[PDB]
Amino acid sequence: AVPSVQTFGKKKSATAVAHVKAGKGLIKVNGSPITLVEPEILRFKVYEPLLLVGLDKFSNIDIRVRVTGGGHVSQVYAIRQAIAKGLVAYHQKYVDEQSKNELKKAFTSYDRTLLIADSRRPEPK
Template identity: 40%
Template sequence: MRVVLASARRKTARARVIVRDGKGRIFINGTPLEVLEPEVVRLKIMEPIVLAGDLVKTIDIFAEAKGGGIIGQASAIRTAIARAILEWSGNEELKKIYLQYDRRLLVEDPRQTEPKKPHGRSARAKRQKSYR
């Protein structure tokens, strides 16, 4: 039995994915993908699975995400799933399909929110100075 581990990050979310031989079952944080809510998150996570086609019917995918918000977690899971499927199959054609569809499927987005600074309500905004 072959097992492939993959991980990815997005903002402050971290995702780990395990891919192994199976019947096409997909679990996200212990929940089957078919019943995952909201629908936007489900559709985002399904992108690399749909692009992989029939290959996914022979494997089981178990994904876990921690930190961040639901969209950040979905993006991290999506990237980790794409990497795991690619490592599992070793298919160069699939890699081309992923990169042509969206480069973020395989390459992490390094952007992080800038920390808040003193004397302001956010990272860049400061209290206005008045001379009169």
Template identity: 40%
Template sequence: MVTNTSGKKKTAIARATVREGTGKIRINSQPVELMDPEMARLKVLEPFRVVDENLRDDVDIDVTIEGGGVMGQADAARTAVARGLVQHTNDAQLRDAYMDFDRSLLVNDVRQSEPKKWGGPGARARYQKSYR
């Protein structure tokens, strides 16, 4: 059985494919062990810290990520992987364990950056003025 899921964070979009396998996890066609920086790799592998080790050995996961920065991509991939595992196993206890651990494993973060406005260099900052 093949399961397709997705995750988002800011402008990063991750699509994960979960299938029966031997425990291979690939991010953009490269093994997850080659992912840099290490903090991003640990974030992507976080869904496996909550579940038992046997689950990781039973599935192959292919993740395609585009857009955003390094940590945004890691957050998106983490959500896609966790959703894929829940959907693949069809296990309510796993879903509840993820929700108790961290809700953002299964629910996308809906926050977006505020648009830039006139009168300043950014969304909120204004140009300085001097009276002398």
């Protein structure tokens, strides 16, 4: 079977499901290229993982992301978290663990929200 991994990203009610499989660098969001994600002002937000680790790593995989719920911003954050988590999971499962560590180090160095869900749970005081 084709090697594949699945991951989830969540921000408020926005949920993104990312499938990462062996491939030829085909990144899609809701059946469209990643370049067409909107709003354009926040597009680079979704690009943040792809640029942090370099496009070479993506050149060998296809990523398909399906997003539902929430608004524009929450969907953008869901997409980026899903892409990062899926990439790290794929490098864990079907590539060396050293690359996994390098990816985790880079992402947590830049923004830990890319991996850990940001849940603003209420705190009575």
